[PDB]
Amino acid sequence: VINTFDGVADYLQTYHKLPDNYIAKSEAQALGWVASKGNLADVAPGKSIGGDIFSNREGKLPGKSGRTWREADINYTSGFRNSDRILYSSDWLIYKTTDHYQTFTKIR
């Protein structure tokens, strides 16, 4: 599994896609994932939540017409989700947050 800051970062730029271990929350839900039970590991072993759109409501991330932001969980293994995420734009700007999108710093 590729689920580290650098790992995923390096992967996105090579391939322009998330590593195989990611799945969207909708897909996770479809598999029986219940956020309140922190059972993700049970229904989809080896997977992490990744690839949903980040609406960037607070305009914290650099904007642009035609720029879409997506997010992915980092350092997840089991149980409840943590606070680490990578933010990637369609033009491949890579940002990180370790505090639940309060703050962001560029990593690529």
PDB file of all heavy atoms in Angstrom, residues 20-35:
ATOM      1  N   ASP A  20      -4.037   2.215  -6.209  1.00  0.00           N
ATOM      2  CA  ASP A  20      -5.099   1.263  -6.128  1.00  0.00           C
ATOM      3  C   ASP A  20      -5.817   1.076  -4.828  1.00  0.00           C
ATOM      4  O   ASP A  20      -6.952   0.639  -4.871  1.00  0.00           O
ATOM      5  CB  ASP A  20      -4.694  -0.270  -6.220  1.00  0.00           C
ATOM      6  CG  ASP A  20      -4.249  -0.603  -7.629  1.00  0.00           C
ATOM      7  OD1 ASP A  20      -4.714   0.090  -8.612  1.00  0.00           O
ATOM      8  OD2 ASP A  20      -3.412  -1.552  -7.823  1.00  0.00           O
ATOM      9  N   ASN A  21      -5.056   1.358  -3.799  1.00  0.00           N
ATOM     10  CA  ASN A  21      -5.640   1.230  -2.454  1.00  0.00           C
ATOM     11  C   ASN A  21      -6.702   2.285  -2.162  1.00  0.00           C
ATOM     12  O   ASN A  21      -7.281   2.147  -1.111  1.00  0.00           O
ATOM     13  CB  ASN A  21      -4.544   1.252  -1.413  1.00  0.00           C
ATOM     14  CG  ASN A  21      -3.345   2.132  -1.551  1.00  0.00           C
ATOM     15  OD1 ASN A  21      -2.571   2.150  -2.503  1.00  0.00           O
ATOM     16  ND2 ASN A  21      -3.221   2.860  -0.437  1.00  0.00           N
ATOM     17  N   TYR A  22      -6.945   3.296  -3.037  1.00  0.00           N
ATOM     18  CA  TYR A  22      -7.941   4.267  -2.634  1.00  0.00           C
ATOM     19  C   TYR A  22      -9.279   3.922  -3.223  1.00  0.00           C
ATOM     20  O   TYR A  22      -9.255   3.327  -4.284  1.00  0.00           O
ATOM     21  CB  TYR A  22      -7.520   5.667  -3.099  1.00  0.00           C
ATOM     22  CG  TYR A  22      -6.358   6.116  -2.243  1.00  0.00           C
ATOM     23  CD1 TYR A  22      -5.029   5.945  -2.535  1.00  0.00           C
ATOM     24  CD2 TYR A  22      -6.703   6.725  -1.021  1.00  0.00           C
ATOM     25  CE1 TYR A  22      -4.056   6.374  -1.654  1.00  0.00           C
ATOM     26  CE2 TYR A  22      -5.755   7.170  -0.138  1.00  0.00           C
ATOM     27  CZ  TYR A  22      -4.401   7.011  -0.463  1.00  0.00           C
ATOM     28  OH  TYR A  22      -3.486   7.498   0.461  1.00  0.00           O
ATOM     29  N   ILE A  23     -10.312   4.338  -2.528  1.00  0.00           N
ATOM     30  CA  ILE A  23     -11.689   4.250  -2.916  1.00  0.00           C
ATOM     31  C   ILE A  23     -12.409   5.461  -2.359  1.00  0.00           C
ATOM     32  O   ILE A  23     -12.101   5.901  -1.246  1.00  0.00           O
ATOM     33  CB  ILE A  23     -12.410   2.977  -2.467  1.00  0.00           C
ATOM     34  CG1 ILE A  23     -12.570   3.006  -0.965  1.00  0.00           C
ATOM     35  CG2 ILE A  23     -11.598   1.764  -2.988  1.00  0.00           C
ATOM     36  CD1 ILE A  23     -13.291   1.771  -0.471  1.00  0.00           C
ATOM     37  N   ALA A  24     -13.380   5.939  -3.078  1.00  0.00           N
ATOM     38  CA  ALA A  24     -14.252   7.056  -2.795  1.00  0.00           C
ATOM     39  C   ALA A  24     -15.196   6.765  -1.647  1.00  0.00           C
ATOM     40  O   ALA A  24     -15.522   5.571  -1.529  1.00  0.00           O
ATOM     41  CB  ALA A  24     -14.990   7.232  -4.129  1.00  0.00           C
ATOM     42  N   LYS A  25     -15.618   7.732  -0.836  1.00  0.00           N
ATOM     43  CA  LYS A  25     -16.504   7.430   0.271  1.00  0.00           C
ATOM     44  C   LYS A  25     -17.823   6.775  -0.145  1.00  0.00           C
ATOM     45  O   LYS A  25     -18.308   6.065   0.706  1.00  0.00           O
ATOM     46  CB  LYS A  25     -17.007   8.660   1.033  1.00  0.00           C
ATOM     47  CG  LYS A  25     -16.124   9.189   2.137  1.00  0.00           C
ATOM     48  CD  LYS A  25     -16.510  10.563   2.675  1.00  0.00           C
ATOM     49  CE  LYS A  25     -16.733  11.588   1.603  1.00  0.00           C
ATOM     50  NZ  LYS A  25     -15.579  12.285   0.942  1.00  0.00           N
ATOM     51  N   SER A  26     -18.317   7.062  -1.316  1.00  0.00           N
ATOM     52  CA  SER A  26     -19.561   6.509  -1.840  1.00  0.00           C
ATOM     53  C   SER A  26     -19.422   5.015  -2.056  1.00  0.00           C
ATOM     54  O   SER A  26     -20.313   4.204  -1.716  1.00  0.00           O
ATOM     55  CB  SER A  26     -19.891   7.387  -3.060  1.00  0.00           C
ATOM     56  OG  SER A  26     -19.176   6.929  -4.222  1.00  0.00           O
ATOM     57  N   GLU A  27     -18.299   4.600  -2.609  1.00  0.00           N
ATOM     58  CA  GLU A  27     -17.923   3.232  -2.886  1.00  0.00           C
ATOM     59  C   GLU A  27     -17.757   2.483  -1.552  1.00  0.00           C
ATOM     60  O   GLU A  27     -18.302   1.410  -1.382  1.00  0.00           O
ATOM     61  CB  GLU A  27     -16.666   3.083  -3.714  1.00  0.00           C
ATOM     62  CG  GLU A  27     -16.635   4.136  -4.833  1.00  0.00           C
ATOM     63  CD  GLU A  27     -15.516   4.025  -5.846  1.00  0.00           C
ATOM     64  OE1 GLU A  27     -14.373   3.713  -5.464  1.00  0.00           O
ATOM     65  OE2 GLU A  27     -15.707   4.284  -7.071  1.00  0.00           O
ATOM     66  N   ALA A  28     -17.044   3.081  -0.611  1.00  0.00           N
ATOM     67  CA  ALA A  28     -16.837   2.595   0.735  1.00  0.00           C
ATOM     68  C   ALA A  28     -18.227   2.403   1.371  1.00  0.00           C
ATOM     69  O   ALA A  28     -18.482   1.336   1.964  1.00  0.00           O
ATOM     70  CB  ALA A  28     -16.016   3.472   1.669  1.00  0.00           C
ATOM     71  N   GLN A  29     -19.115   3.371   1.216  1.00  0.00           N
ATOM     72  CA  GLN A  29     -20.444   3.215   1.801  1.00  0.00           C
ATOM     73  C   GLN A  29     -21.241   2.003   1.259  1.00  0.00           C
ATOM     74  O   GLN A  29     -21.900   1.244   1.972  1.00  0.00           O
ATOM     75  CB  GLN A  29     -21.230   4.487   1.547  1.00  0.00           C
ATOM     76  CG  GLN A  29     -20.821   5.419   2.684  1.00  0.00           C
ATOM     77  CD  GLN A  29     -21.259   6.827   2.276  1.00  0.00           C
ATOM     78  OE1 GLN A  29     -21.721   7.505   3.197  1.00  0.00           O
ATOM     79  NE2 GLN A  29     -21.099   7.246   1.023  1.00  0.00           N
ATOM     80  N   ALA A  30     -21.116   1.843  -0.028  1.00  0.00           N
ATOM     81  CA  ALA A  30     -21.716   0.790  -0.814  1.00  0.00           C
ATOM     82  C   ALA A  30     -21.270  -0.558  -0.300  1.00  0.00           C
ATOM     83  O   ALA A  30     -22.000  -1.591  -0.458  1.00  0.00           O
ATOM     84  CB  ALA A  30     -21.303   1.108  -2.255  1.00  0.00           C
ATOM     85  N   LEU A  31     -20.075  -0.625   0.274  1.00  0.00           N
ATOM     86  CA  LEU A  31     -19.526  -1.818   0.851  1.00  0.00           C
ATOM     87  C   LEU A  31     -19.857  -2.024   2.319  1.00  0.00           C
ATOM     88  O   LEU A  31     -19.299  -2.993   2.863  1.00  0.00           O
ATOM     89  CB  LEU A  31     -17.991  -1.909   0.806  1.00  0.00           C
ATOM     90  CG  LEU A  31     -17.433  -1.723  -0.600  1.00  0.00           C
ATOM     91  CD1 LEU A  31     -15.937  -1.883  -0.546  1.00  0.00           C
ATOM     92  CD2 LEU A  31     -18.090  -2.690  -1.569  1.00  0.00           C
ATOM     93  N   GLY A  32     -20.663  -1.230   2.931  1.00  0.00           N
ATOM     94  CA  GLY A  32     -21.014  -1.393   4.314  1.00  0.00           C
ATOM     95  C   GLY A  32     -20.222  -0.537   5.272  1.00  0.00           C
ATOM     96  O   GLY A  32     -20.401  -0.741   6.485  1.00  0.00           O
ATOM     97  N   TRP A  33     -19.404   0.335   4.710  1.00  0.00           N
ATOM     98  CA  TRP A  33     -18.662   1.206   5.669  1.00  0.00           C
ATOM     99  C   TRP A  33     -19.573   2.118   6.486  1.00  0.00           C
ATOM    100  O   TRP A  33     -20.365   2.813   5.847  1.00  0.00           O
ATOM    101  CB  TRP A  33     -17.665   2.060   4.871  1.00  0.00           C
ATOM    102  CG  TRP A  33     -17.008   3.078   5.735  1.00  0.00           C
ATOM    103  CD1 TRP A  33     -16.317   2.786   6.882  1.00  0.00           C
ATOM    104  CD2 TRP A  33     -16.939   4.489   5.552  1.00  0.00           C
ATOM    105  NE1 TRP A  33     -15.815   3.916   7.397  1.00  0.00           N
ATOM    106  CE2 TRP A  33     -16.160   4.987   6.608  1.00  0.00           C
ATOM    107  CE3 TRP A  33     -17.393   5.425   4.604  1.00  0.00           C
ATOM    108  CZ2 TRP A  33     -15.853   6.355   6.757  1.00  0.00           C
ATOM    109  CZ3 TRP A  33     -17.120   6.799   4.733  1.00  0.00           C
ATOM    110  CH2 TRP A  33     -16.327   7.231   5.797  1.00  0.00           C
ATOM    111  N   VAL A  34     -19.496   2.201   7.791  1.00  0.00           N
ATOM    112  CA  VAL A  34     -20.308   3.092   8.625  1.00  0.00           C
ATOM    113  C   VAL A  34     -19.321   3.991   9.368  1.00  0.00           C
ATOM    114  O   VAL A  34     -18.583   3.315  10.146  1.00  0.00           O
ATOM    115  CB  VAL A  34     -21.149   2.294   9.615  1.00  0.00           C
ATOM    116  CG1 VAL A  34     -22.073   3.224  10.368  1.00  0.00           C
ATOM    117  CG2 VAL A  34     -21.932   1.251   8.793  1.00  0.00           C
ATOM    118  N   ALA A  35     -19.307   5.312   9.127  1.00  0.00           N
ATOM    119  CA  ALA A  35     -18.301   6.177   9.764  1.00  0.00           C
ATOM    120  C   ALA A  35     -18.275   6.078  11.268  1.00  0.00           C
ATOM    121  O   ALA A  35     -17.175   5.974  11.863  1.00  0.00           O
ATOM    122  CB  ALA A  35     -18.497   7.513   9.125  1.00  0.00           C
TER     123      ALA A  35
END
